[PDB]
Structure formats: C-alpha cells, structure tokens
Write a protein that binds this ligand. Structure first.
Ligand code: PRO
Ligand code: PRO
Ligand code: PRO
Ligand code: PRO
Ligand SMILES: [Mg+2]
Ligand SMILES: [Mg+2]
Ligand SMILES: [Mg+2]
Ligand SMILES: [Mg+2]
Ligand SMILES: [Mn+2]
Ligand SMILES: [Mn+2]
Ligand SMILES: [Mn+2]
Ligand SMILES: [Mn+2]
Lengths: 385, 385, 385, 385
C-alpha cells in the first residue's frame, strides 16, 4: 500500500503545517517552511500540494518578499516534481472578515474580499492550478437579525459571477469549487451542505464554471451520508475536487486523518470514487492532532494515503467477487439501474400489471437480501473472506 | 390571538388523527373520522386540511367505498367552508414500499408507485388542491451496497418527469413540492435537505413545475438552520408550501406543535415568511403527543395557530420599532442589501479603495453591534420592551 | 469465525422476532413463535435468549395460556441447550404506560408497573436468569411542566428499592441492570446515559444489587464514546450485562446488527471487554432491517456473532504484536497506569521536580506518538499488517 | 429587569475578556485588564467575578509580578464591592497539557498539574472563593489506543483525592466542583456529562467535598436536557455551582449569552433553580461573539443578566397562576410527588387494586393534559396571558 505520485494524493500546506492552536490551546509545534513540507510530502509519495494565499505568502508581505516566497516554493516544486492542482483564498482568519468576505455586511469588506481573491487566482494560474476553491467559513451568523439570508445570497451570487467574469476575461482554464460546511466558525454557515451549494450554482450566470469541493467531515457535521452527497454531486457532473479526512459524527470539525472517524463511510466513499472514475486530486484536508511531534505529523499524513489505498483494494475486491455480483443481483441492484418506464406515460397508464393486476402482497413478501450483501461488504473490508 | 380562515392555517388529516402508535408503543387514541376532524379544525379557526390518499380512503377500498368516503369528506368541507390546498401520496406505510416507491430496487414497485400517485393527483385536483407534495420517506438505505445513489436519482428524475408529463397532459394547474428529510424511517434518505431537493429540481425536464415543501423538524434533524433554508428556497422562487412544527434538535422526528422545540427559530421563521410575503398555506404537520386524549389533541392544534399568531405580532413589532430600525442600520443590514460592485469588474479592479488603499485595520475595528440588535429581538419576543 | 455456545452470544426474542413495524410503516414479516426463534438461534451457535414478559406470554393471557406458553418455551430450551441469562419487563408498549411505569404521574400506574415487574421476576428466576434488566423507555417528558424530575427520581428510587426488597425477601440471586437511553420514545428519557444511571444507583438502599446494561446505540444517540462509558462502568464494578448493536450517530435508534454503524467503536469495545475479562453474556439487541425476509433475519443475526469474533481476533492480535507493545510504551500507556503520587501529598509538595524545577517546555515538546499507534490499530483491524 | 449585586450574577475574567481568537480566526479585540473588567461588570450590576490562575497572573510571572497583579485585582474588588466566589486552574492552554493534566500519560505532567492546582487553591482561598472548579478539558483522546480509560480514572481519582487531602490539611472551607463536557478540545472528554461526574464523585475518598459545575452548553453538546441534568444534580445534593450560557444544539461549544440558544430550556432551567432554592452564584461562562467591539461585549454581558431576570419573572408568574395550579393538578403533578407504596412491599403485593383488579384500560384512557399545561407555560413565557 505504498503511494506514488500516480495516485494523485495532495495535501494542503495548512494541514501538515498546522501548529496545533485550537480554541482552548496554544501551539504545540513550530511553524513549517512550505519548502520543507513540499519535500517531506514528496518523500512520502504525494502528488502535490495546495495553498491559501496566506499560507504561502504571509499576510502583509511586500512585493519583494512575495516574489521570494514564490521563488522558493517554485524551486521546491521543481526539486521534487510536486504539482499544485488547487489553490484558495483565506477569507476567514483576518479580523476584517469577522462577518464574512463575499457576504460581509460592510460593502467595503466585500470589495476587498473580491480583490484579495482575484490576486490569488492569478498566482494559482501561474503555479498551474486547475481548480480554485472557495470556502465561505465566515459567511453566516450567530443571531437571526444579523444576516438577511436572501440579501446575503444576492451578494454571494454577485461575487461568484464577478469571479467568473474575471477568469473569462483572462482566458484562464481554471474552474471554481465551492466548499460547503454547516457551521464553525459561524453559528450557521451559508450554503451549509453539498445540496445547498449545488442549488446555488444553478443561479449563477455561468454555472458551467462552478462545482463543489465537498469535505468528508463537513457533511458529517450535519449527520449526513457523505457517499450519498458525493453521488449527487457526481450525478450533477459537479465533483470538481474533494477533501478527504475523518470525523466522529456531530461535533466540532475534527479533521482526523482519512480512514479515521467513520471507517465504513470511508470504504463506501472510495468504492464510489473508483467506480465512477473520479479523476481529480485525492486531497487531504486534515490536521495531525496537536498531541503529535513532527514525526507524528508525517506518520499521520502517510496514514491518509495508506488508508485510501487499503480501502481501494478492498472495494475493488468486493465489486469483483462473483459471490458479491450474485448478491447484487439478488438484491436487484441491476433492476435499480433499468428505466422505470421507457415505454412512456401512456403505456404505463394502460399497463394493468402496474396497478389493477399488480400483486402488492407478492412484491412485499420478496426480501431485499440487503443484510447478506452488507456482510459480504464487511467481510471484504476486514479481510475475512 | 384567535385564528380565522383568513390566516390560511391548514392541518393534515394524519396530524390530529394520529392514534399514538410509535416504535415502542401501541395506540393511545381511537381513530378519527376525517369528517369529525374537518369539523373540529374548522371550529378552531382552521382554513383547511390536507391528506394522503390512504388517510382519506382506506387502502384496498372498492370503487363504491371510495366514492362514499369522498362524498362524506366533500360534505364536511361544504358544511364548514374548509378547503383542501394540498394533497399527497402514501408511498411509505405499505410493506411493498419497504425499499422505496419511486426508487425501489424492484422496477414493478416503482411503476406501481407512479400509478398510485397519478390516481391521487386526479383526486387532489377534484378536491381543489393547488399543491401536490412528495415525501420520499422510503427512498434511501441502511447499508452502502443496497442503493446505488446515482441510479436511484436517475429513477427519481424519471418518476418526477413522468408526473410532470401527466399533469401537463391533463391541463392541471397543480404544482409539485418535494419534501426533504435526512433520515427516518430509512437510515439515510435521498434528497436529505432543502438544498439537495432544490439542486435535484434543476435537473428535471420542466423545473418550473416543482418546488420544495420544507418541514421545520426535518431540517433541524440535520442540525440545520431552518429560517436559513427557507430563505434559500425563497431566493430560488421555490417555496411552494411549508410544514410547521417543533423539534428539539438532532433525534427522532418529534412533530411537536409549532412553537415548541426551538422557539427562537420559530420567531425568525415567522419574521421571514411575513417579510417575504409568503402567500401559501401555513400547514402544520405535527402530532399531538400520545399522552393526550382528544381534548388534548384539539388543544395542541389550537396551540399551533396561537403560537404562529403571537410570533407574527412580535416579529412585526420588532421590524416596526424605530429603535430596531436604527440598530439594523448600526449593524449595516442596509449595506448588506446594496450591490457589491454595480460599477462592474474593471471598475473594481481599478479601485484603489478596494485593496491598495483599503484600511483593513479600521474596517476590522468596526463592531457589528449584533448583540444589541439580538437583545432587542429577544426583548420583543418576550414582551419585555 | 464460527460461534459456539461457549462464546456466550445471546439474543432477545424481540430482535429476530421484530415484525418490521416502524413509526411510518406496517409489518413486513409474520410473527415468530418463540419456539422457532430458539431453534434457529441455537442452529446459528447462540448460547441463549432473553425476553420481556410480553414477548413470551401475550399480554392478557389466562393462567392456563401462560402455563402453556412457558411449557413450550421450556421444551425449546431443553431441545436446544439454550439458556436464558436475562429477562426484563415491558413497561412501554401498553398505552397505560404512556407517561411511564415507575415514574408515571398516576400513582395507580406506578403500583401496577411494580406488580407487573415482580410477577416477571419470579418467572425469570424460574427460567434461570441471573440478570433482570430495566429499561425505563417511557420515563421522561416531551414538555417541561409535565414531569418534575426530582419527584420522578424519588419515585424511581422507591420502585428500585422495593424490587431490591422483593428479591432479598425471596432469597433470589438475581441482580438488576438499569439500561440508559437518552431519548425515544419520550422526548427526553430519565437516566439518559451510563453516567446518570451509575450515579442514581449510588442513592439506592442496596446499591450492590444494581448495575448497568448499556447499549451501543443508546450512548451513541447522545454522541458519546461507547467504549469510554463501558470503561467507566467497569471501573465502578457495575457492568452487569451489555447490549450490542450498531448505530450511525445521532438519530433515531437504528438497532443495526453489531459491527454495523461505527465499526472502529465496535473494535475498541471488543478490545476493552476482552482485556477487562467481562464474563457476562454478549447480548445483541438489534433489529434485522424491515427490508429483509426471514432468511435475511437469520443472516443478520449470524453477522452479529461473526463480527464480534472477527473483532476479537484483530484486537487480540493488536495487543499481542510486539510492535504495538513498543508503540504503547512510546506513547506512555505504561506511565498512565502508574500512580501519580504514591509518595504522598507532602512528598509531592516538597518535590521541586514537580514544579519549581519542572522543565515544562521539554515535557511539552515530547510527542505522544498517538498517530503511529492508531495506524497500527487500523492496520490490524483491516488485516493490512 | 435591572440586576443588582443581590442577584448573585458572576462572570469569568475570560468571558468578557475573550479576544475573539477561534480555530479559524485571529483576535478581533484587544486584551482587557482584569481591573477594567471588574469595574465594567460592577457598573452593570454584577455581584462578582471568577478566574483561572492564568487569567489573573500571566503564565511564567515572577513572584514580584504575581504580587502586583494580585494587588491591583484586590484593589479593583475593594473599589467596586465585587466578590470572587469561585476560581479554577488552567490545565488546558499550555502545550504541556496536550494530553491532559491529571490524566496525562506522562506522570511528570500529572504531578505538575497537581502542583499548579494547589498553588491556585491557596490564592482562591485568599481572595475569598468558596468553590474551586475543575474542568478537565484535555482529559480524553482522539483515538482508542491512546488512553486506557480505567487507568485514566484511577489517575483522576488519585488527583482529586490528593486535592481533598490538601484542603483538609489546611483547614480550608472551599469545596470542589467538577465541570463536565462531552468533547472539544479532545475528541472525547472523560466524565462527559453531569451523570458521569456524579458517578465518579461517589468513588472519591471524601465525596462530601465534591459536587458538579454543569454548563448549559456542555450538556446540550450531547443533546441532553439541561434542566433534567440539573434536577438530578439537585436530587443528589451536588449542585455546588452552575455555568449559564446558550448553545444551539450539537456542534462546537458556542458560549452564547444566556437566553440565546435554547430559549425554552433557559426558561425551564430558571424555573427549576428558583423553585429548588439554588443559593449559589448565577455564573455566566459565555463569549461575546468576535463580531463585537467592546460596547458589544458589555451589551452581551448585560443581556445575560437581563434574560435571567425576565425568565425569573415569567417562571414565577407561571407557578403562581391559579389556572396553572389547576392544570398541574389536572396533569397529576401532585400525584407524582406522593410515594408509590408507603404502605410497604407486602401491602403492595396483597393489593388487588394494583394488579388483579386494576382497570388498565380506564387508566390508559385518562389523558395527561400536558399540551394545555405547556401552552400555559408558553403563554407565560411570551407575555401572552
Ligand atoms: O473525471 C471525472 O472526475 C468525472 C467523474 C465521472 C466521469 N467523469
Ligand atoms: O407569494 C409567495 O409565496 C412568494 C413569496 C415571495 C414573493 N412571492
Ligand atoms: O467478570 C466480570 O465481568 C468483571 C469484569 C472485570 C473483572 N470482573
Ligand atoms: O442552597 C442550595 O443551593 C441547595 C438547593 C436545594 C436546597 N439547598
Ligand atoms: Mg476543506
Ligand atoms: Mg411533513
Ligand atoms: Mg437494549
Ligand atoms: Mg464553563
Ligand atoms: Mn474540516
Ligand atoms: Mn416530521
Ligand atoms: Mn436500541
Ligand atoms: Mn462552554
């Protein structure tokens, strides 16, 4: 289960570089130079790295400082063969964004948020990024009167439409991916789930430029089924990027390494991504727990990739097993994939077998055989076949 | 706070008619004749009632029995002046729907589900319903291999497209409203939130025919902010109907009377519906707790309406209070409603006040004054002004 | 991974006998004769069965009917070698218990609840049960004024004290196990967690007679860590019995087969029970999903036992692996088991190495190595060593 | 609704002094001098303040610096008439406590945690504190193998027993209050609820010295009913202190001002504290949201007290209303307070009215009238009587 760059595993600078500060704790690790992170990740078999503007260039840097930060980072990529498939903007850390970036009540802040974003889009394109993520972590409210949500969505659409106009004007090939989260740091965050983000995209001027960047932990913070949400995103042709990690149910955003948290959901996620032929980066947005030293940081990062590869093997074995294939037919997964009424509306209305002469009791008596199918899945996952 | 039919309050037959059976309990009340429910609800000041096919006509009824059930119900409506603004299909109770209706793995069940629905659409139109609700409570899974979600969404779209073709073919004016729920009775239900339902509608052949019917308790079962979800539905022009009740957070679907559960969320919901000019029914999908006798049933129903009217008064007082209006300006809710960049992209790029000469520290130092605004809201709600 | 009676696996009659009725659904399976359940479970390698009074003897049975039900059940036990290690009372199904049994507001209902319980204690002893479970599923409230909780706890203590007096008076060896659940069917249930039950027991007249019967799904409905709660119960010497199943986080009580739901929590639970030498029944309180026919029922039951045995193997391998033993020392699990201050208070106060000369920075810099340890655990669980 | 010191409202230095740092955000406010906080709080009508050691004396202070910090604080108390009824230790911020204080795997850290605590107990006594709180926020784990919970509870008991021995040895009158929280910052925290803490106390050497300090938001993070937990604490005679705030269900610890979050739970809490005659401080552990400037900080603090006083008035009016008193009798709250079987076990066994001649159907048919009672409560809360 050794990863290589061909596996497309990527990591945010802010992941392995997390110093361990939490709402009740000071840092437990020294800051990492992005150059060292790129080197260590490459050694582990990563394909690339991602960044917020402010991860790569400290906020408030002069043009000369900016140039040097980028130069060193560029050299690290060149030294290792690492890529930068995605980048994003920090519109959440600085106190100016305390009520949001794109949907701040203050109009001057909204305009600044757009300019900060546009600056980093140019840099992302320079470094070769194909996807530009937007996580509106500060868009939302703690109280009901503070944020008129219809007005906020008007502002959010205005912002994304302007970004689309910008990339079009420059002839950039980059596309946007909106990252939903239901809460934290705001009491409620706007576009809280994959569904809300997908719906919002449909109202944009150029919807083809926008997809979703769902995160395992985020959908799980709403108690939702992450593989189901990913399936709906795939169904809509909008899974532009994905963030992999672990989460134990409904609580603060844990950002455990992938495989941790809900292990079976991780299995079903990998099964879906591989079956569907998802071809984007397998990106980890995780935090090595603050209990760890740097050796533990790299161990945790390695574990992300290892767990993906183990689950990949087991899911493939599951789908390829003739006994499982038989069980899938027994449970009528084949029938689920057949149209309900390709014969058309009038034919359905005229079909007595669909109502007048439908034996409901006989149909009801037919077991779904889902438990046997699921125990085959369990046996494959655990290597107990 | 006395309701009258002008207030548009409606109730499902299955609400006040709930006999009190739960997953661990037998019935605590006798069944109600729909005729008596219509009379008692009218006496309380309700505007109308809604029904599943199987609430009004016992499953398996002959044509003669069906005719008599409808005749008696029609007479009750005529005797009281009650309306029927919405109807729906029961695609969840009968064991044949154990794996779903529209997305059952068994194709014969999917076809039957469509025929059962179509039959009741005709009846709904006959009784004057303007909205036809679909709650896919059995669409989903307890285990990962049982349901391929992309295939299931293909089947779900096929079903809704056929229903749209049907209403179009008959020249009916009725529109559809999809009701999301995240779980229960299935381990995970497809289209689990308002966002997922909105997104799905965009992929239908005739999206203009479909909106959402969100329920307070359902979105709260995912820990989501219900007023926020309703705002996004309104923003999309898709709030075709709404179900009002109460829920205490993340647990089984409680169906408490409206006002119970999250009281402040109820306040903000009423504030939003009234401000936006929502003009549809104020429908209660609640269950008087099984502790209650029939006197308690009608008391609980009356309380639904009373709480709506109290909250309406307090929200209106809040919005009309000059002190609140001043606080809203102090918190820049006015600025939130102004376009970010009506001057356009190039103007924004050329505007030094948006970046090069933006004083981020001065902006950051400006308090939002949200706590004072929220305490004014609290004071209005509690009648402590 | 074939179970035999030596493994002490037991099942409730109401588990495999669940007909599939849920809050939105009619039965999907015919009722099972307890005699057939005993036979089928024995064939699968079960050790025994458990019952509520009303599972074994239909409510309202005459003395002659009662005698025959017991006679047939006795014969099934004798035919199979099955045991009955635990029994319990149904104080939740009948509408008389709509506000509770032991803590019903109506005093006559409380007295009846006690008499019903006492009758079944006699039967449980006759059939050889060593543990008598009490799940107060109806003890609680949907609204704040309905239940004064201090008064309710007074009544709950009165009830349990009387039961203790009863078993003492008869010279029975049977002990009680209180089963916590946080909610469902009541909006909030009294003694909602293992902790609350443990605390309550300390106020009983004869606390030695009472322990807990925790259920995996129940603690998980509060988002709690089930292995942690079981550890506290063991620490207190109060794990008299346990109910095993699966649950996907915070929602309605799913009662999935053991191993389903939170797989890693199942692993850590088995690790703890085996390490601690828990010697009681491994009891499954689960429901085969209503999608299943009878073949699926027995498959689901078999899966409960299979998953326990797989996890047992993997946990044992984990603890026995010299590499894991080294990692445990690296993470100072050995130090966690050593007293903090066996030298005593004055020695600690006088020890400059504990404060005045404690190098906090050096201590802080020492990584815990928890991620490497956890990936070894993951590798063992998945059979990827 | 103007608070005065007689109302016993207290605030932590770290509450109004929170600079607004969160897991995704830098500070939005400057640090407050404890002297200014004491003055501003007194002006608002507070009774007193509380502190962690490190809130009052910056970590690493020399003896001379320590003396001056205390001197200035003492002068502020004297200038205002403010009291210090409670103090606590910071065993969570410094990286040395990354795996805990009292239950750190490293024994040297456990010993240091005890010495740090003991030092501050002396200071707390000097400043007049009657209660010493312990919140073990770092006691717990993110992964299963990292923490053997039985061993950890052994260490936790050792620590609390030593603290008890210490206060006894000094003749101090101060008592301890253990503050539960289910998670955050650790993935799972030990003693996660009021119940677990109560149970743990019973195993201490001198249980009379220890009670609980429950927090509204903390119990709600497990989805539990806070008034119910407070009732069990009162029932056990262990409510030594309480922390008041607001929380919107199951998510990160929000620390909203009291009254925010679950408003009806706040009502029922105040009703219980006032009815029971809780005589300790009404302490607020809240954070003014980081959106706020200093004016908003004091507004938020004032709102805590205002909401307590409004709810106090409404709860008192509810209990005093003859119509409510009649409704309480109708719902048999009086019967709930009467012993079930003061006649004794044998009398109950011999009482045919308790079983043989108990009319279960007649009892079952009696409605509880809980909905009418609850709407009276709603009407009182909203000032709609
Ligand atoms: O390449 C991709 O990522 C998508 C997934 C479905 C087919 N194409
Ligand atoms: O009539 C309605 O319901 C919608 C609400 C927004 C404006 N029109
Ligand atoms: O036999 C049992 O179940 C308990 C477990 C710890 C040691 N004895
Ligand atoms: O004074 C107190 O706080 C406790 C409350 C119940 C009676 N005494
Ligand atoms: Mg992310
Ligand atoms: Mg509904
Ligand atoms: Mg159980
Ligand atoms: Mg606190
Ligand atoms: Mn995250
Ligand atoms: Mn509902
Ligand atoms: Mn259960
Ligand atoms: Mn808190």
């Amino acid at each position: 289960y050794q990863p290589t760059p061909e596996d497309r595993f990527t990591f945010g600078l802010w992941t392995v570089g997390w110093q361990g500060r939490d709402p009740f704790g000071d840092a437990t690790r020294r800051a990492l130079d992005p150059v060292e992170s790129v080197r260590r990740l490459a050694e582990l078999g990563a394909h690339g790295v991602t960044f917020h503007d402010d991860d790569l260039i400290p906020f408030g840097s002069s043009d000369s400082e900016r140039e040097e930060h980028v130069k060193r980072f560029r050299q690290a990529l060149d030294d290792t063969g690492m890529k930068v498939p995605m980048a994003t903007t920090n519109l959440f850390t600085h106190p100016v964004f305390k009520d949001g970036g794109f949907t701040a009540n203050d109009r001057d802040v909204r305009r600044y948020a757009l300019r900060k974003t546009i600056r980093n889009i140019d840099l992302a394109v320079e470094l070769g990024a194909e996807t530009y993520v937007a996580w509106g972590g500060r868009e939302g409210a703690e109280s009901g009167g503070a944020k008129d949500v219809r007005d906020a969505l008007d502002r959010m659409k205005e912002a994304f439409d302007l970004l689309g106009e910008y990339v079009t004007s420059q002839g950039y090939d980059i596309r946007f991916a909106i990252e939903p989260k239901p809460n934290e740091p705001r009491g409620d965050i706007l576009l809280p789930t994959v569904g809300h983000a997908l719906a919002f995209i449909e109202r944009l001027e150029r919807p083809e430029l926008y997809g979703v960047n769902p995160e395992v932990g985020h959908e799980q913070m709403a108690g939702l089924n992450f593989p189901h949400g990913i399936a709906q995103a795939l169904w809509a042709g909008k899974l532009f990027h994905i963030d992999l990690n672990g989460q134990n149910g409904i609580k603060y955003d844990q950002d455990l390494r992938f495989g941790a948290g809900d292990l079976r959901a991780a299995f079903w996620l990998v099964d879906l991504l591989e079956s569907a032929g998802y071809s984007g980066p397998r990106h980890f947005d995780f935090k090595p727990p603050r209990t760890e030293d740097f050796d533990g940081v790299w161990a945790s990062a390695a574990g992300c990739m290892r767990n993906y590869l183990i689950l990949k093997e087991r899911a493939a074995a599951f789908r390829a097993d003739p006994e499982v294939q038989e069980a899938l037919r027994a449970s009528r997964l084949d029938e689920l994939a057949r149209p309900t009424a390709a014969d058309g509306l009038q034919a359905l209305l005229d079909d007595r077998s669909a109502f007048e002469e439908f034996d409901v009791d006989a149909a009801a008596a037919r077991g779904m055989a889902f438990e046997r199918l699921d125990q085959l899945a369990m046996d494959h996952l655990l290597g107990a076949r």
